[PDB]
Amino acid sequence: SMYDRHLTIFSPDGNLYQIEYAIKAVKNTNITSVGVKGENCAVIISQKKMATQYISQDKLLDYNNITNIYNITDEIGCSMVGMPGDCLSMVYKARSEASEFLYSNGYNVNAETLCRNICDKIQVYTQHAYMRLHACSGMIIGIDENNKPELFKFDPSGFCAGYRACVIGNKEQESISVLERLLEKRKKKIQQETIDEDIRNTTILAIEALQTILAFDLKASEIEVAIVSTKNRNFTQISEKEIDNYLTYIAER
């Protein structure tokens, strides 16, 4: 019919164009996030940038409040890219899902299951016509019950998967090429790492990847970096000073 691109119903070729348009809406925000997995840790790096939306960035804006990284629980955090209302909504949905899991089962949900439950929530928006799609794509990290890091990514279509490294942003084929090169370069070394060495290398890889993707010099004040490891399983950001030190090391090499 004339409205097959208005609702979540199949078009003649089998597509649900509303899902495609929600994904494009995510892409329109011009926000880039990168998650990278180590051997005993995981990192997420995002721009501390307001999503390109109707309103613009004022010089009286408090730039410290601008963020795309959230804690879901003490041990699980995420990056939510897309429409800020939808991103906040998904953050709250994920927090409530994690809390309900904990109460029902007496132990904390791991990142994989939380991602899958979130995507089961999103599928309902994809099938019921009266609800708008949440223009939001996310990355979720945590340390699973075997002390292994997890990196999972969901998008508006309700599809999720685990990754060695991932990028949400405008470009993702070339981001994938950059990340694959960085990962193989890191993997070709045979010397064993310490926990601290592994965390340092993972964070440097995340920063250098975001930089090689965005194609300009990252300033420590305009990006955010969050980590989870077996040394510190809490999902914690790192200071602007440590980000700056990582950047000075990256530049001088």
Partner: protein
Amino acid sequence: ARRYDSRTTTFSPEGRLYQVEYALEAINNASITIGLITKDGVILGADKVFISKLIDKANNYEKIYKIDKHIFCGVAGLNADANILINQSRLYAQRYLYNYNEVQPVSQLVVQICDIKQSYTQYGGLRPYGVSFLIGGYDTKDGYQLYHTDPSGNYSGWFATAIGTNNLTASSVLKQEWKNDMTLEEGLLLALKTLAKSTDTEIPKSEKIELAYLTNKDGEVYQKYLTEKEIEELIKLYTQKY
């Protein structure tokens, strides 16, 4: 959101219900289903739609279904809608048995399922069921019975009838050949004849035929779903007799 409503349960300028007409077109586009009453029981026959030689053709009847011990139906139309309504009618028969401690008369069961269909045509904003039923059975009140239902919730009793594609040819064959006191064998041979002539051929093929009948013998009502072997035997008898 009203702009997306297709208004299924709304009269047309000629007092017609378009969704029901289209459901009837779909039923008319389904494979032939026939039924006829002998003095030995009700016969239901159907042509199977070919999909692949890899379908499992053992104990897999997809157009004739048991509703109760004394009731069984043939389907013409959308098979999933039919599955829904068949589940409902099995429930209805068992509910009647629970409430009254006796098996449900056939006409009451047909009325209940047809009420479901009519309700979908009158209330709500959903599309109707795209299925026609040939319901046959036995009960002490009315003996052997055979009924035909359509998406509008209509029904009517028949001594012989056909639904689905090319029902005109099969109905004419039945009108010419059906008699008031036939034996089970004669009924089965006539069912094979009308199935063969509606499918545009002369000798029918066992692979494409579903045949079942329902007899009240010695006081027990018993349903027989003929296998490919029994149908092959009957096909040989038919090719002898014609």
